Scaffold this active site. Structure first.
Site, PDB file in Angstrom:
ATOM      1  N   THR H   1       0.658  -1.181  -0.122  1.00 52.26           N
ATOM      2  CA  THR H   1       0.082   0.122   0.073  1.00 52.26           C
ATOM      3  C   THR H   1       0.872   1.127  -0.058  1.00 52.26           C
ATOM      4  O   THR H   1       1.518   1.652   0.930  1.00 52.26           O
ATOM      5  CB  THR H   1      -1.143   0.098   1.208  1.00 52.26           C
ATOM      6  OG1 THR H   1      -2.027  -0.807   0.635  1.00 52.26           O
ATOM      7  CG2 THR H   1      -1.453   1.285   1.596  1.00 52.26           C
ATOM      8  N   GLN H   2       1.055   1.864  -1.173  1.00 50.26           N
ATOM      9  CA  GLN H   2       1.921   3.096  -1.405  1.00 50.26           C
ATOM     10  C   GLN H   2       1.100   4.073  -2.210  1.00 50.26           C
ATOM     11  O   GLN H   2       0.082   3.705  -2.876  1.00 50.26           O
ATOM     12  CB  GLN H   2       3.127   2.619  -2.170  1.00 50.26           C
ATOM     13  CG  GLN H   2       3.064   1.644  -3.192  1.00 50.26           C
ATOM     14  CD  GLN H   2       4.464   1.399  -3.715  1.00 50.26           C
ATOM     15  OE1 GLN H   2       4.866   2.075  -4.372  1.00 50.26           O
ATOM     16  NE2 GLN H   2       4.954   0.272  -3.327  1.00 50.26           N
ATOM     17  N   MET H 107      -0.138  -6.863  -1.447  1.00 51.79           N
ATOM     18  CA  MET H 107      -0.790  -5.471  -1.297  1.00 51.79           C
ATOM     19  C   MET H 107       0.592  -4.434  -1.038  1.00 51.79           C
ATOM     20  O   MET H 107       0.205  -3.619  -0.342  1.00 51.79           O
ATOM     21  CB  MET H 107      -1.688  -5.358  -0.152  1.00 51.79           C
ATOM     22  CG  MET H 107      -2.964  -6.418  -0.189  1.00 51.79           C
ATOM     23  SD  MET H 107      -4.060  -5.562  -1.179  1.00 51.79           S
ATOM     24  CE  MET H 107      -4.632  -4.073  -0.415  1.00 51.79           C
TER      25      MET H 107
END
Ligand code: MG
Ligand code: MG
Lengths: 212, 222, 195, 196, 125, 222, 204, 233, 195, 196
Positions: H1-2, H107
Site C-alpha cells: 500500500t503506497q 498488497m
C-alpha cells in the site's frame, strides 16, 4: 433462500428452495441447498453457498474418519459440534452460515442441530433459515403435529417452502424434499414451484388472491 | 459520446456518434446528439442527455423570441452567452457539455461550453468520453484553410476514432455543415459502418406458444 | 440470551434464566437452558454474544471437571468464581474477547453457606445476596431491595422471584418466553419443573 | 498557469502562457488568458475558468456602464469592481486576477486581486502554478522606467522559466502592450522562447 | 532442542530402550486386573519395607481417569503421573467435543499411543 | 488507497449437449472505457478434455487457469497418468478458489467437458468456490442479457404446446452441436449490440470424445 | 434505499405492422416481500398508452397527473392527444422536477390517429426521450428485457405474432428478476381496436 | 500500500512486418505537474528485447536492476548464454508478469505499467503489457496512460488487425509512432519534447535512438485566437 | 406502534392493532388504540414514527369530518383512501416527512361491499383482501394465503385473525401486549370487547 | 528548507539555509543542515528531521564499515546506501536527500534521492519549499567547470531568492566546499545575502 427441517414420528423432513440471487438478478433456479454429508447425515445451505458447501463436504470427511477410528456411526451431536467448533475458530473472519445438521441414530433418535457462523449450536424440533423463513414458520407452526404420517409430513415441508417461494422474492425455482430415517435419508424428488403452485392452488383451494 | 467541431474556409462542421448508454447498457443504438438552437446554429451535447436537450431547447426558444424581437438572424455569441450564464447559475448541477457552431451575419463561429459555464474558442474541438480518440485524429490531420469536403472527412474520421476505440461511443456518424450564404445541411446517419449481421436463426414463435388466462376488448373510444 | 437472575436465600441459591433464543426477527427456540453444572454443588448461568456464551460455559465446565478428577475434591464456589473471573479478565485484552456475563450459584459444604457471584464480561466479580446482568437488574433490583431478607426460605425466595419475573413480563419490551429456575443447596442441584 | 504584468516607461505589458488543463489532459493548448474589460484595461485570470469568465464579463458590463455615464474609468476603478465581486462572493468563487491598465494621467498601473479578495497595487506581479503570486521574483532583474523591448524580454524570460519547470503552463506566450499609442498583441512560439 | 535417537534398532532387530523399560515394569510392585460378570476389580501390591508411611496422603496406586474408568500400573511411579494427567485431560477433551465420555478401549488406545510416540521420538526415553 | 481488483469485462457461455459440450467467450479485453486487446483468448484447453474460462479480473483469471493446468499436470505424476474426470476437476477448482476465501479470485469460473458416461458436462463456480453442474450457464458482463434467452431457447421455459391451453409444456430434448453454436453466435451478437464491453471476436471451444475443436467468429468492433 | 428498485416491476413496448404492443408484470413488493399481484403499470389517456416502472407512489402520482393534463388538453384542443405530443408532455413534466425527480421509467405506446404510424418512446427519470423504431424497455429487469428483445424482435410482425414475441420477451425477463413477475398483462394496439390479455406465469 | 511520487507518462508500441517499435519521453513528473528531466524509460535487455516502463520512477529503477540481475544470472554456468540459451522476450515478460502479480497479491505493488517489446528466436514479434495489478494482454498496438487514449487510435489506423502486420513496413510504423508522440506532447501535461524510440528488427537487430525531439509542430493558428467568445481584439 | 392487520371478508372489514406503546426500555402503555373513525363506515389503523402517527390520523379525521358537514354526505372508502394517499405522497418530498403507515377499512353503502386499503408512508396505495405493515406481514401472509376465502363470514375471519395473532405471539421477539379488534360493516363500526 | 549542491572545476559545493520550523514557530534559526557521512561525502536533508537524522546516522555507519574493509567509498556508493534505506522503507519514511561528494578520480559529483526513493546523478540540484526539486532553475545561469568564487556566488544568489519568497527558509546560509585541498565551511549572514 428458504430451508426448513423438523422432527416427527417417521424421522426428519428436510425441505429447501433452489434459487440463488446476486442483487435483484436470479443467478440460478437449480441450486442444491441440501448437502449430502454422507448417506445418514444431511445439511442445509443458507448464508454463504461456498461456506456451507465446503465445510459440510469437509464435515463428511471428518465423519468418515470418526467411524474408521471408532467403528461406530458418528452421533448427530458429535457431527454438529465438529462443524460448530470449526466455524467458531473462524469467528470474525466473515464466514456466513445458517445450517441444520440432520441425522437419525439408535441412541439419539431423529436429531436436528441448527449451527451458524457466529458459533451458535441449538438442538430443536423445528428450524427454518433464510430470507423466507418467517413464511415457512407460519405454515409449520399451525399444521405441525408429532404424530404426522410420512406422506403428510413430506407435503407440509413442500407446502411451507411454496408459501415462502410465493411471498419472498429471493426464494423459489424448485422444492427439494428429503426424508431422514434411521437406515439413512431418502430423496423425494425436485418439484418445480411454477407447476406445484397451480397444482396446490386447484387441489387445496388456497391462494384465492392469485388469478389462475 | 464523441462530438467534434471543425472550422473550414467558408463555415464550420460538427459531427457526433449515435450511441446512448445507461452505464454499460446501450439504450438507443441510433439517437441524434446534433441539436438545432437556430436554423444556422447547431449544438452537439455530451454528459447528462436530459440536460443537453433541455438547455439547448430553452436557449433555442429564447433565441427565436430574441430573433423576432430584433428582426435579425440570431448570432452564435448570443447562444454562447445565454448558455454559459444559465450553466454558471447552476454551478455544474446541469451536466451539459456542448460544442456550439453556426454562421450568422458576423461570420462562422465554433465554441465549446463546460457544465460549470466556462467557454473556449477553437478551429477544431472535441468533447465526451471519445474526445481524446477524436482529438488525436484532429491533431494529426487538421490544417489551416480546409475545404468543405476536407472538413467533413476530418470530422467523420475524428468520430470514427471514438466509435472504434471508445466504449462510450459507437453506431453511426451524424454531421451538420453550416456554410456562409447557404442553408445548413443536417446529414443524419452520414456513415453507417456498424450494421448488425444477419442472425443465424429466426426466433418467430408458433402461434399459441404463450399461455393466456384472460382476453378482453379495451375501450379507447368515447 | 437476555435475562439471568440470582437470589441467595438462607440455605440455597436460586438462578432464573430466560428460555428464548432470538436470531434476527424470529424466536428460534423457547426452551433454551442458559446454565451449565460446573460441579455437583456449583451452577453457572450465562448471557451475552451468541456462540461465545456456550463455548465459554463448556470450557469452564471441562476445566472444573478436570480439577475434580485430578484432586478427587470439589473446588469451593469462591475458588470456581475466582478461576472464572481470571479467564474473563484474560479475555478482555485478547485478540477477540468473550462477550459473556455469568452468575455462579454454589453451596460451600465446608462453610455450610450458599454463595452467589456476579461476574461481567470484563471480569468484574462481586458477591451479592441477589444479582442480574444487562437490563434485568433495572426492573427487579428495586423490588429485591424492598422484599429481600437474609433469613428467607427457598419457598419465600421463589415467590420473590415470581414477583420479579411478573414485573419483567409487564414492563420489558421483548418476550423472553419465561424462565427455567434451578435451586443449589447442600443436597446438590435440582430444577423447579413448573414456573 | 503563469501570468505576469510589468509597468515600464511608456505603459504596462500583460503576458501569459496558452495552456488550460483538466487533470493532466491539456483541454486547450492555444488558450487566450489575456481578457479585455476596457479598451486599455486588460486582466490575467487564474483559478476556476467558469468563475473568472463570469467575473470578467460582469466587470466588462460595469466599465461599459461607467464609461456611458462618467467617461473613461481609471485602472484603480477596474481593480475595485473586480475586488468587490471577488471579496463579497469569496465563499463560492476560486478566482485570482491581475489587472493591467493604461491612463494618460496615471500611465501604466498593475493591481492584483488574489484568492483572499484583497487588492494590491504593484510595479509588476507574477502568478505561477495555482494562482501562486511570488513577492520577490528577481527584484534586481526589474527596474522602473524600463523600455518596451527590455520589458518584453523580461516577461519572455520569466514565463520561459515557469513553462520549463511547470506542466500547468505551456504552449505559446501571449502578450498585450498598453500605451498611449494603443494596444499591441504579441505571440511568441515555443521555438523562440524554449532556447532561453 | 535435544534431538538424540535413544530408542533405536540393534542388529538382532530389538529396541533395547523399550525392552529395558519392560525391566523397570518387572521391578515395579505387582498389579492385577480381574473382570467378573457385572464388575472389574483392580488389585495392587504395596511393598512392606516402608513403615511410618502416611497412607492418607501417599499417592494411591489406582487413579480415576474419569468417573467410570480407572488406571493401575507397574513400574516408575513418576512416569505413571504423566500418562495419568494426559489421559485425564483427553477424557475431558473427548466429553467437550464428542459430548460423550470415552469408551475404555478409546482411553487405552490414547495412552498406548502416547507410550508408542516416546519409542520413536528424538530426545525422549 | 491501492485497490488490488479490476474489471477486464468480457462474457463467457457454457452449454452441455448429449455427447458434446461448448465453452464460448468474446475475445475483447477492456479497462473502463478503453479496449486493451480485440483478441485476448480467455477460454483454454487444460488437457484431459477439460476446457476452462475464469472471467472477471483477468490477472486472477490467468492465475487460476495457470494453477489448474498445473493441478492437472501433478495429478498425472501422483496418480499414474490417470485421466482427471470433469467432476474431479470441479472439486479441485473449489479447493483452489476456497483457498483464497479471505482474499478471493475476482472471477466467475466455468469448465466444460464430458462426464465418465461420455455425456456433455458444464460446471459453474462463484468467486469463493461454490459450484454446481448445469446444462446452460452464461458468465460475466452480459450474463443478464444472454441467460434469460437460453432459458427460453435451450430449456424451452415459458413455451407451452400450442392448443393445450398452456397445460402441456414444450418437451425438453438435446440440441445438435450445429443448433447450439447458432444460439451461442446469436447470444453474443445480441449482447454485442446492447453491452459496450462485449464485441470484437467470439471464440468457441467444442469438446467431443474426438477431442477439443476451435471455431472463431467476428463481432462488431464499436 | 434505491427508490427505483424498492417496489420492482417491468414495462416493455414493441412496434409491429400497423400495430404496437405494450406489456408489464403485475408485482408490487416492499423489497423482498410481495405485497400485490394486481398492480398494473400500464394506463391509457384516449388511444395513447403509458407504462411506468419505478417507485410505485410516483407511478400512481404520475398516472393521476397525466390524466389531469390530458383531460384539460382534450377540453381546450377539442381532440384526444397523440403519442408524439404526449411524449413531449411526459418529457416536460419530468424535467420540471429536475432537482427533485420522480423515480420512474415511463414508456409511451400508441398509433397516430391521423398518419396511422406506430409510435413508442422511453424516458429516464428526468425526461430524456429515447425514440426507437424497434422496442423500449424499463424497470428492474431492463438488462434481461434488452437481451430478450434484441434476439427475439424482428420488424413488421403481425399483431398475432408480435403478441407472442413481446409475451415471451417479458415472461423470460421477469423469471430472471426477483422483484418482477406475479402475473403479466399484454396490450395489442391496432388503429381502431385494442385487445388486453393476462398471461399465465410462475408465481414465485 | 503506497502512493506514486515521481512518475513517467505513456509508453507506446506497435508491430510491423519484421519487428516491433516502442517509444517513451525522457521526463519524470512530480505530484502537482512539476517536471524532472533526463529519465530513460526504455530498458534494452540483451539484443532482442526492450522493456518500456511507465509509473513510479523508484519502482522503475528497481525493475531495471532485476532485469540487469536476470542477464547476469542467465550467463551463470551457461556456455550458450549468447546463443540458444540467451534470454527471450517471452521469458523476460513472464518473469516481470509473475513479479507484478505476486507484489499486488501482497498488497505492496510496483506502481508501473510495462510493455515488453522484442523478437523471439524464430523471428516471431513479441509485444505484451503487464501493470501493477498483474493484468496482462497482447495486441498489434499497445500503450499506457494517455497513449492508450490518444496513441492507440492513431496506431490502430495502421494495424487494425493481425493481417495488417505483414503489410506494415518499418518506415510506415516509425512515422505512426513519431506522429503519435507529437500528439501526446500537444495534449499530455506530463509529457516532454525529448523522447527515446527503439526498433527491434529480426534482420537488422535492435536500433536504439536517443535524444529524439518532436518536430513539424503546428502553433501558427494560435495568433488568430482571441478571448473565450465575444472578444475581437 | 408495530402490528396492524386487516382482513376483508364477505360482508365486513376486520382491523387488528397491537396495544403496546414502547419508549426506550419500558412499555409505557398496554391499552393503546391505534385507530381513528374517519366517518361512520370508515376506520383507519396506523403505525410508524411516534407523534407523527396520531397527528396524521387526527388531521385526516378532521378533514373527512369537515367534508361530511359541508356536503351532508359520507365520502366513499375509495375516495377517503385516495385523499389519504395524496396527503402521504405530498409528505414524502416535504421538509420533514410523516413516517406513518395506515390501513383504511370501510363499508361502501352504494356498492354494499367491504373495502380494505393498505397505504405505506410513501403513499403506496393497494386494495387487498388482507393486508399488514412492517414485519407483521412476514409471519401472517403465508397463513392468510392458505386459509383466506372471499366468502368468509365475520366469525370465520375472526378465527383466521386469532391464528395470525397466535403465530405472531410465538415467533415475534417483541411483546405487542395483544390486539384491539374492530369490525366495519353496513351497520357501522364496533369493537370486539374480548380477544 | 532551501538546499542546493553545485559541481564546479575543483569539486562540489553544498549550500543550505539554517531555518527549522514547527508550524509557523522557528524551532531552530541556526540549524546546520550540512551533514557529514564521510570525510568528503556530505548530504543536505529535507523532510522529517527524525527520519533524515536516523538515515544519515545509518549511512555514516555503513560508510565507516565500508572504509574499514574496502577503503574510501565513491559518492555513487554513498548515494546507493541512502537510496536503499529510502526505497525499502518508503512507506514509513518522509526523507529527500541531496548527496555531494569529492573523489580524486571522479572529482565533484551530485546525487538526489527524492521522496520516491529513486536515485538521479545531476551536475547540480536545488530543493525548495517542502523537499521540492526544480529541474531547470536558470539552466543558462549554471555552466560546467565554474570557478569556486562563481559557484559560491551562484549558490548564494539562488538561496537568497528562495529565503526572500519562502518562510520555511531563513537565518544564515551555510556552505561546505569539497575539493582535493580538503573541506571548507562557509557561513553568510543575512546582511551580506539580503542585499542581492
Ligand atoms: Mg459492443
Ligand atoms: Mg421474478
Amino acid at each position: 433462500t428458504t430451508t426448513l427441517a423438523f422432527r416427527f414420528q417417521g424421522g426428519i423432513i428436510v425441505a429447501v428452495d433452489s434459487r440463488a440471487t446476486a442483487g435483484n438478478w436470479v443467478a440460478s433456479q437449480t441450486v442444491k441447498k441440501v448437502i449430502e454429508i454422507n448417506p445418514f447425515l444431511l445439511g442445509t445451505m443458507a448464508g454463504g453457498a461456498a461456506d456451507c458447501q465446503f465445510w459440510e463436504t469437509w464435515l463428511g470427511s471428518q465423519c468418515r474418519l470418526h467411524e474408521l477410528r471408532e467403528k461406530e456411526r458418528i452421533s448427530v451431536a458429535a457431527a454438529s459440534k465438529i462443524l460448530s467448533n470449526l466455524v467458531y475458530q473462524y469467528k470474525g473472519a466473515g464466514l456466513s452460515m445458517g445450517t441444520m445438521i440432520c441425522g437419525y441414530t439408535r441412541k439419539e433418535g431423529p436429531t436436528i442441530y441448527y449451527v451458524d457462523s457466529d458459533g451458535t449450536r441449538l438442538k430443536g424440533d423445528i428450524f427454518c433459515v433464510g430470507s423466507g423463513q418467517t413464511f415457512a414458520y407460519g405454515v409449520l407452526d399451525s399444521n405441525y403435529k408429532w404424530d404426522l404420517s410420512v406422506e403428510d409430513a413430506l407435503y407440509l415441508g413442500k407446502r411451507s417452502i411454496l408459501a415462502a417461494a410465493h411471498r419472498d422474492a429471493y426464494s423459489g425455482g424448485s422444492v427439494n424434499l428429503y426424508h431422514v430415517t434411521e437406515d439413512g435419508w431418502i430423496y423425494h424428488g425436485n418439484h418445480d414451484v411454477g407447476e406445484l403452485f397451480w397444482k396446490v392452488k386447484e387441489e387445496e383451494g388456497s391462494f384465492n388472491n392469485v388469478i389462475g | 459520446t464523441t462530438i467534434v467541431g471543425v472550422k473550414f474556409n467558408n463555415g464550420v462542421v460538427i459531427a457526433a456518434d449515435t450511441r446512448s448508454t445507461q452505464g454499460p447498457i446501450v439504450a438507443d443504438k441510433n439517437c441524434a446528439k446534433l441539436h438545432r438552437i437556430s436554423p444556422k446554429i447547431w449544438c452537439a451535447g455530451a454528459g447528462t442527455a436530459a440536460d443537453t436537450e433541455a438547455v439547448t431547447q430553452l436557449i433555442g426558444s429564447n433565441i427565436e423570441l430574441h430573433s423576432l424581437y430584433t428582426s435579425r438572424e440570431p448570432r452564435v455569441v448570443s447562444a454562447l452567452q445565454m448558455l454559459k450564464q444559465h450553466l454558471f447559475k447552476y454551478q455544474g448541477h446541469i451536466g451539459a457539455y456542448l460544442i456550439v457552431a453556426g454562421v450568422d451575419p458576423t461570420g462562422s463561429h465554433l465554441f465549446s461550453i463546460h457544465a460549470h459555464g466556462s467557454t473556449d474558442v477553437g478551429y477544431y474541438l472535441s468533447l465526451g468520453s471519445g474526445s481524446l480518440a477524436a482529438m488525436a485524429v484532429l491533431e494529426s490531420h487538421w490544417k489551416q484553410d480546409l475545404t468543405k469536403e476536407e472538413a467533413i472527412k476530418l470530422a467523420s474520421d475524428a468520430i470514427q476514432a471514438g466509435i472504434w476505440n471508445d466504449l462510450g461511443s459507437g453506431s453511426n456518424v451524424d454531421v451538420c455543415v453550416m456554410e456562409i450564404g447557404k442553408d445548413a445541411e443536417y446529414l443524419r446517419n452520414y456513415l453507417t459502418p456498424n450494421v448488425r449481421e444477419e442472425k443465424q436463426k429466426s426466433y418467430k414463435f408458433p402461434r399459441g406458444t404463450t399461455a393466456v388466462l384472460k382476453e378482453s376488448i379495451v375501450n379507447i373510444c368515447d | 440470551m437476555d435475562i439471568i437472575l440470582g437470589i441467595r436465600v438462607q440455605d440455597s441459591v436460586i438462578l432464573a434464566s430466560s428460555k428464548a433464543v432470538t436470531r434476527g426477527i424470529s424466536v428460534l427456540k423457547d426452551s433454551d437452558d442458559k446454565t451449565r453444572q460446573l460441579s455437583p454443588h456449583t451452577l453457572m448461568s450465562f448471557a451475552g454474544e451468541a456462540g461465545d456464551t456456550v463455548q465459554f460455559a463448556e470450557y469452564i465446565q471441562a476445566n472444573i471437571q478436570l480439577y475434580s478428577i485430578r484432586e478427587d475434591y470439589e473446588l469451593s464456589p469462591q475458588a470456581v468464581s475466582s478461576f472464572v473471573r481470571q479467564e474473563l479478565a484474560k479475555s478482555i485484552r485478547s485478540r477477540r474477547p468473550y462477550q459473556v456475563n455469568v452468575l455462579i450459584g454454589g453451596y460451600d459444604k465446608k462453610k455450610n453457606k450458599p454463595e452467589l457471584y456476579q461476574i461481567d464480561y470484563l471480569g468484574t466479580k462481586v458477591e451479592l445476596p441477589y444479582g442480574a446482568h444487562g437490563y434485568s437488574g433495572f426492573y427487579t433490583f428495586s423490588l429485591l431491595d424492598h422484599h429481600y431478607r437474609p433469613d428467607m426460605t427457598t419457598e419465600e425466595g421463589l415467590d420473590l422471584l415470581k414477583l420479579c419475573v411478573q414485573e419483567l413480563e409487564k414492563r420489558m419490551p421483548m418476550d423472553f418466553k419465561g424462565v427455567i429456575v434451578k435451586i443449589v443447596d447442600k443436597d446438590g442441584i435440582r430444577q423447579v419443573d413448573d414456573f | 498557469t503563469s501570468i505576469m504584468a510589468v509597468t515600464f516607461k511608456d505603459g504596462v505589458i500583460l503576458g501569459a502562457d496558452s495552456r488550460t488543463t483538466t487533470g493532466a489532459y491539456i483541454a486547450n493548448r492555444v488558450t487566450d488568458k489575456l481578457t479585455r474589460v476596457h479598451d486599455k484595461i486588460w486582466c490575467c485570470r487564474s483559478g476556476s475558468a467558469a468563475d473568472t469568465q463570469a467575473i470578467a464579463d460582469i466587470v466588462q458590463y460595469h466599465l461599459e456602464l461607467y464609461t456611458s455615464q462618467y467617461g473613461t474609468p481609471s485602472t484603480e476603478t477596474a481593480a475595485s469592481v473586480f475586488k468587490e465581486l471577488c471579496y463579497e462572493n469569496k465563499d463560492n468563487l476560486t478566482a485570482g486576477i491581475i489587472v493591467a491598465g493604461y491612463d494618460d494621467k496615471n500611465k501604466g498601473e498593475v493591481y492584483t486581486i488574489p484568492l483572499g479578495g484583497s487588492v494590491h497595487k504593484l510595479p509588476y506581479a507574477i502568478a505561477v502554478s495555482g494562482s501562486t503570486f511570488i513577492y520577490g521574483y528577481c527584484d534586481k532583474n526589474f527596474r522602473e522606467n524600463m523600455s518596451k523591448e527590455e520589458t518584453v524580454d523580461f516577461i519572455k524570460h520569466s514565463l520561459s522559466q515557469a513553462i520549463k519547470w511547470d506542466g500547468s503552463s505551456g504552449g505559446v506566450i501571449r502578450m498585450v502592450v498598453l500605451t498611449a499609442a494603443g494596444v499591441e498583441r504579441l505571440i511568441f512560439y515555443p521555438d523562440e522562447y524554449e532556447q532561453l | 532442542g535435544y534431538d538424540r535417537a535413544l530408542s533405536i534398532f540393534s542388529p538382532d532387530g530389538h529396541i533395547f530402550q523399550v525392552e529395558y523399560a519392560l525391566e523397570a515394569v518387572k521391578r515395579g510392585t505387582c498389579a492385577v486386573g480381574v473382570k467378573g460378570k457385572n464388575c472389574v476389580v483392580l488389585g495392587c501390591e504395596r511393598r512392606s519395607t516402608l513403615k511410618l508411611q502416611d497412607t492418607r496422603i501417599t499417592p494411591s496406586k489406582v487413579s480415576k481417569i474419569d468417573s467410570h474408568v480407572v488406571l493401575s500400573f507397574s513400574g516408575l511411579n513418576a512416569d505413571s503421573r504423566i500418562l495419568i494427567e494426559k489421559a485425564r485431560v483427553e477424557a475431558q477433551s473427548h466429553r467437550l467435543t464428542l459430548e460423550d465420555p470415552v469408551t475404555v478401549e478409546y482411553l487405552t488406545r490414547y495412552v498406548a499411543g502416547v507410550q508408542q510416540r516416546y519409542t520413536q521420538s528424538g530426545g525422549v526415553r | 488507497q491501492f485497490n488490488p481488483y479490476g474489471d477486464n469485462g468480457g462474457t463467457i457461455l457454457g452449454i452441455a449437449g448429449e455427447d458434446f459440450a461448448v465453452l464460448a467467450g468474446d475475445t475483447r479485453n477492456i479497462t473502463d472505457y478503453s479496449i486493451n486487446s480485440r483478441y485476448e483468448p480467455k477460454v483454454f484447453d487444460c488437457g484431459d478434455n477439460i476446457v476452462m474460462s475464469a472471467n472477471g479480473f483477468a490477472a486472477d483469471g490467468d492465475a487460476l487457469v495457470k494453477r489448474f493446468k498445473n493441478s492437472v499436470k501433478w495429478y498425472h505424476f501422483d496418480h499414474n497418468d490417470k485421466k482427471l474426470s470433469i467432476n474431479s476437476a470441479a472439486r479441485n477448482i473449489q479447493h483452489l478458489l476456497y483457498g483464497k476465501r479471505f482474499f478471493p479470485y475476482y472471477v466467475h469460473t466455468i469448465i466444460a467437458g464430458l462426464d465418465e458416461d461420455g455425456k456433455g458436462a458444464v460446471y459453474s463456480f462463484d468467486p469463493v468456490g461454490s459450484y454446481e453442474r448445469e446444462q446452460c450457464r452464461a458468465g460475466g458482463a452480459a450474463a443478464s442479457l444472454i441467460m434469460p434467452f437460453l432459458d427460453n431457447q435451450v430449456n424451452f421455459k415459458n413455451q407451452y404446446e400450442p392448443g393445450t391451453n398452456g397445460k402441456v409444456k414444450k418437451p425438453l430434448k438435446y440440441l445438435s452441436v450445429e443448433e447450439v453454436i447458432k444460439l451461442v453466435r446469436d447470444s453474443f451478437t445480441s449482447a454485442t449490440e446492447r453491452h459496450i464491453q462485449v464485441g470484437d471476436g467470439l471464440e468457441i471451444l467444442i469438446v467431443t470424445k474426438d477431442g477439443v475443436r476451435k471455431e472463431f467468429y467476428e463481432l462488431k468492433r464499436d | 434505499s434505491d427508490p427505483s428498485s424498492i417496489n420492482g416491476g417491468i414495462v416493455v413496448a414493441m412496434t409491429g405492422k400497423d400495430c404496437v404492443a405494450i406489456a408489464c408484470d403485475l408485482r408490487l413488493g416492499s423489497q423482498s416481500l410481495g405485497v400485490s399481484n394486481k398492480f398494473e403499470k400500464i394506463f391509457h389517456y384516449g388511444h395513447v398508452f403509458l407504462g411506468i416502472t419505478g417507485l410505485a407512489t410516483d407511478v400512481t402520482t404520475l398516472n393521476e397527473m397525466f390524466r389531469y393534463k390530458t383531460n384539460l388538453y382534450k377540453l381546450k384542443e377539442e381532440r384526444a392527444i397523440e403519442p408524439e405530443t404526449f411524449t413531449q408532455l411526459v418529457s416536460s413534466s419530468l424535467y420540471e422536477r429536475r432537482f427533485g425527480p420522480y423515480f420512474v421509467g415511463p414508456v409511451v405506446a400508441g398509433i397516430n390517429s391521423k398518419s396511422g404510424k406506430p409510435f413508442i418512446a422511453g424516458f429516464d427519470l428526468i425526461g430524456c426521450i429515447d425514440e426507437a423504431k424497434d422496442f423500449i424497455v424499463s424497470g428492474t429487469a431492463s438488462d434481461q428485457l434488452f437481451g430478450m428483445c434484441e434476439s427475439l424482435y424482428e420488424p413488421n410482425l403481425e399483431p398475432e405474432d408480435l403478441f407472442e414475441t413481446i409475451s415471451q420477451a417479458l415472461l423470460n425477463a421477469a423469471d430472471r428478476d426477483a422483484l418482477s413477475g406475479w402475473g403479466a398483462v399484454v396490450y395489442i394496439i391496432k388503429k381502431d381496436e385494442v385487445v388486453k390479455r393476462y398471461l399465465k406465469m410462475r408465481q414465485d | 500500500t503506497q502512493q506514486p511520487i515521481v512518475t513517467g507518462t505513456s509508453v507506446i508500441s506497435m508491430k510491423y512486418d519484421n519487428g516491433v517499435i516502442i517509444a517513451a519521453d525522457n521526463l519524470g513528473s512530480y505530484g502537482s505537474l512539476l517536471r524532472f528531466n533526463g529519465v530513460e524509460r526504455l530498458i534494452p535487455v540483451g539484443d532482442n528485447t526492450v522493456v518500456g516502463i511507465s509509473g513510479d520512477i523508484s519502482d522503475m529503477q528497481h525493475i531495471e536492476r532485476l532485469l540487469k540481475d536476470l542477464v547476469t544470472e542467465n550467463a551463470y554456468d551457461n556456455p550458450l548464454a549468447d546463443a540458444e540459451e540467451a534470454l527471450e522476450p517471452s521469458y523476460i515478460f513472464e518473469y516481470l508478469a509473475t513479479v507484478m502479480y505476486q507484489r499486488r497479491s501482497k498488497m505492496n505493488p510496483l506502481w508501473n505499467a510495462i510493455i515488453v517489446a522484442g523478437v523471439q528466436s524464430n523471428g516471431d514479434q513479441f509485444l505484451r503489457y503487464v501493470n501493477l495489478l498483474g493484468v496482462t494482454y497482447s495486441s498489434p498496438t499497445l500503450a499506457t496512460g494517455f497513449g492508450a487514449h490518444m496513441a492507440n487510435p492513431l496506431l490502430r489506423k495502421v494495424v487494425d488487425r493481425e493481417s495488417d502486420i505483414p503489410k506494415t513496413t518499418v518506415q510506415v510504423a516509425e512515422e505512426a509512432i513519431v506522429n503519435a508522440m507529437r500528439v501526446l506532447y500537444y495534449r499530455d501535461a506530463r509529457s516532454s519534447r525529448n523522447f527515446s524510440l527503439a526498433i527491434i528488427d529480426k534482420n537488422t537487430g535492435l536500433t536504439f535512438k536517443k535524444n529524439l525531439q518532436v518536430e513539424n509542430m503546428k502553433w501558427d493558428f494560435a495568433k488568430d485566437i482571441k478571448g473565450y467568445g465575444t472578444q475581437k481584439i
